[PDB]
């Protein structure tokens, strides 16, 4: 980046990797049918939505990783916690 280099401190792979990780956190088992299912796609789009929201705060390396990771742990806790009340 000569004069245009905002995103440089983050690679595309980082974002896509984390976004898939976010999706994977929500649903780890890669089902070949569900993979081609719209409902999963909505969730994947939701993960990108998260990426968009984070980006403003994410104006620093540590912030960016922490934002995504923290939410993932939150999400994982939610599932286990609520399922505790099953039956």
């Amino acid at each position: 980046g000569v004069r245009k280099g905002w995103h440089e401190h983050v690679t595309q792979d980082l974002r896509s990797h984390l976004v898939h990780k976010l999706v994977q956190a929500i649903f780890p088992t890669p089902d070949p049918a569900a993979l081609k299912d719209r409902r999963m796609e909505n969730l994947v789009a939701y993960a990108k939505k998260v990426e968009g929201d984070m980006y403003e705060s994410a104006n620093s390396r540590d912030e960016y990783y922490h934002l995504l990771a923290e939410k993932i742990y939150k999400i994982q806790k939610e599932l286990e916690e609520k399922r505790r009340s099953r039956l």
Partner: peptide, 19 residues
């Protein structure tokens, strides 16, 4: 509020699904 935490319905999907 872009939804940093996932709403119930999306979360339900994984709970309802079991390979």
């Amino acid at each position: 509020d872009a939804g940093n935490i996932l709403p119930s319905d999306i979360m339900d999907f994984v709970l309802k699904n079991t390979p």
